[PDB]
Amino acid sequence: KEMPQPKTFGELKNLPLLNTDKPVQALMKIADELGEIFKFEAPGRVTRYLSSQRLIKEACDESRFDKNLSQALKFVRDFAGDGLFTSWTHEKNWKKAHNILLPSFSQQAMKGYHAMMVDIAVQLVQKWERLNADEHIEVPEDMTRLTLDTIGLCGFNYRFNSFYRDQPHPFITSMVRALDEAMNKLNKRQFQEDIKVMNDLVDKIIADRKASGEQSDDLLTHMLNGKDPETGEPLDDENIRYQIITFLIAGHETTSGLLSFALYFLVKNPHVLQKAAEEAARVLVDPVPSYKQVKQLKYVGMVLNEALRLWPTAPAFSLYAKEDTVLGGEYPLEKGDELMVLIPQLHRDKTIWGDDVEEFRPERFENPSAIPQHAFKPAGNGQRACIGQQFALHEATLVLGMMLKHFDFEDHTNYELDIKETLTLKPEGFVVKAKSKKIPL
């Protein structure tokens, strides 16, 4: 009944324990030591970190707990505003935007984003095809170039052309500078300038599209044409801007991290790589993969789910108790008390996954119906789960499938995993050499 709590530093409470470049990995070690629930305090704040499926399934009951705007989300809200990710569930724009955008993020909707995803995918594979013998690839760097550009094209038909440059388009620079500044807060002049660079570009694109009247296959067209069936209202131009900035912020790094971690696990487990590469060869028989072919990349999808099991790229999400309640028959909580779900620990719960939790075994996802409810939560929970989850997996399955069709990979530095933490996780410094199989592209 008494909750464990790690070391306290007087009036600093537990804050000093997170004065580190890798706070989630430090919290996982605290979960290692204290078990399924621990208390964590900062000067005027309290949170309880949950690690076991037993307690997390109760936390995921939406009649009892709702998404909380953590301090990180409040700082990201200075530029993400009231877009989906940084809104309270009871804010009117959360509901409006959710009802309008849901159907445009469905698996069926991926069919209309497929060609633009392929356009950027092909640009990445062609870059690697064109490398000389004395060169290597910087994985996370190229995966981020890919994901940013794909979200810019599918989101608002805008080309960042990140594969044509050494220094990123100026929006990307301000966006990543903006996000790092908000994560560092856990400058002001630079922060305000970076907000303006983001709003100026996105506002201009929205004003240009409304002027032309053109209809394309992007999310902006859907937002300009959508009407919330409940209120009957469309989103205004400011909120559309925040949704756009939000797709980029929430989707670019989580998705590039997944691709980087999946390639990492594959070069470290050659037998799994070979099985995934043999599926890619059999399925992707055309020089341009089709939507239906990506859907048949089943083992590739299993590789991606297992990479997400071990290193879910948006690793913690925050909840608040809606009313007074008791968690797991043991821990009484009051209305408003906050819970943090530590996804990487949930995904290491030996009572669900077996004792081999640290092993990379995509075969765990062979039968998706066997995974207990709330045991696997890389996309968060319920109505506040990631709306971009079908987009992210289609993109990553498409791209990983193409990589495996076209190249053999070498882990030429015997890379040592070093997980860098920002809003998201990624394998910093991960580099490979790819040798082309010379297959038509």
Contact 340, 48 (CB under 8 A): yes
Select the binding partner of residue 99 from ligand HEM, a copy of itself, none (C-beta < 5 to 8 A, by kind).
a copy of itself
Backbone angles phi, psi at 314, to 5 degrees: -120, 85
Shortest distance, CB of residue 361 to a copy of itself, whole angstroms?
Answer: 9
Shortest distance, CB of residue 334 to a copy of itself, whole angstroms?
Answer: 23
Q: How many CB atoms lie within 10 A of CB 144?
A: 23
Q: Which amino acid is at 34?
A: L
- Residue 390, classed as helix, strand or coil, is helix
CA distance 261 to 381: 22
Shortest distance, CB of residue 351 to a copy of itself, whole angstroms?
Answer: 4
Q: Does 314 bind ligand HEM (CB under 6 A)?
A: yes
Contact 265, 272 (CB under 8 A): yes
| Binding-site size, ligand HEM (CB under 6 A) | 25
Select the binding partner of residue 332 from ligand HEM, a copy of itself, none (C-beta < 5 to 8 A, by kind).
none
Alpha-carbon distance values, 135 to 124, 130, 191, 377, 411 (Å): 15, 10, 36, 37, 13
Shortest distance, CB of residue 12 to ligand HEM, whole angstroms?
Answer: 26
Per-residue contact string for residues 70-89; x = within reach of ligand HEM by CB under 6 A: --------------xx----
| 49 labelled binding-site residue | yes
Q: Does 120 bind ligand HEM (CB under 6 A)?
A: no
Contact 435, 410 (CB under 8 A): yes
Out of 247, 299, 407, 430, the residue judged to bind ligand HEM by CB under 6 A: 247
| 154 labelled binding-site residue | no
Provide DSSP, 101-158: HGGGGSHHHHHHHHHHHHHHHHHHHHHHHT--TT--EEHHHHHHHHHHHHHHHHHHS-
Per-residue contact string for residues 103-142; x = within reach of a copy of itself by CB under 8 A: x--xxxx---------------------------------
CB of 257 or CB of 289, closer to ligand HEM? 257
- Rounded (5°) CA angle 1-60-36: 35
CA distance 138 to 140: 6
CB of 162 or CB of 345, closer to a copy of itself? 345
Residues from 62 through 91 that contact a copy of itself (CB under 8 A): 62-63
| Site stretch for ligand HEM (CB under 6 A), options 164-172, 187-195, 313-321, 327-335 | 313-321
CB of 52 or CB of 243, closer to ligand HEM? 243
Tally the C-alpha atoms within 13 A of residue 74's C-alpha that lie toward its C-beta.
7
CA distance 414 to 410: 9
Q: Which amino acid is at 42?
A: A
Select the binding partner of residue 4 from ligand HEM, a copy of itself, none (C-beta < 5 to 8 A, by kind).
none
Select the binding partner of residue 366 from a copy of itself, ligand HEM, none (C-beta < 5 to 8 A, by kind).
a copy of itself
CB of 39 or CB of 384, closer to ligand HEM? 384
For the stretch 14-23, contacts whose Cβ atoms lie closer than 8 Å and that sit 24 or more positions apart, written own/partner, are: 14/40, 14/41, 14/42, 15/41, 15/42, 15/43, 18/186, 21/420, 21/421, 22/419, 22/420, 22/421, 23/421
CA distance 21 to 155: 32
Residues in the site for ligand HEM, rule: CB under 6 A?
67, 84-85, 98, 151, 246-247, 250-251, 254-255, 258, 312-314, 317, 378-380, 384, 386-388, 391-392
Residues in the site for a copy of itself, rule: CB under 8 A?
54, 57, 62-63, 99, 102-103, 106-109, 229-230, 350-352, 354-355, 359, 363, 366-367, 369-370, 372-374, 382-383
